[PDB]
Amino acid sequence: RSRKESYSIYVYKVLKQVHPDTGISSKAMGIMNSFVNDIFERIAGEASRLAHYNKRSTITSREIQTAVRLLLPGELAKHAVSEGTKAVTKYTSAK
């Protein structure tokens, strides 16, 4: 039996965080998995173009930041950059 992938449990937990009293359909969970897929793919493609228009092959978080604020529209993007940056601080401040 080949082991297949999903992101269902993760975003499921996130949904339980932001709304404890809320159910969901299974197809919509698949939709959100496809959503994460699509956003990830556009970001990664912008990362590869970041590489080739920078002639470098290392990926750091700075490239991810500039990729996100290339793709996403402004206000949403800046809030997301804030979330990611504070997470970078909280992780890399410890181990």
Chain position carrying tokens 């997470």: 87
Task: Report residue 45 CA to chain centroid gap.
Answer: 14
Q: Which of the listed partners (other proteins, DNA, none) does 1 bind, with a CB threshold of 5 to 8 Å by partner kind?
A: DNA
Site for DNA in 11-50 (CB under 7 A): 12, 23-27, 29
- Answer yes or no: are the C-beta atoms of 59 and 51 closer than 8 Å: yes
Tell me: does residue 56 bind DNA (CB under 7 A).
yes
Tell me: does residue 93 bind DNA (CB under 7 A).
no
Structure tokens at 83: 């979330």
Kindly list the residues in this chain that would bind DNA in the complex (CB under 7 A): 1, 3-6, 9, 12, 23-27, 29, 56-58, 60
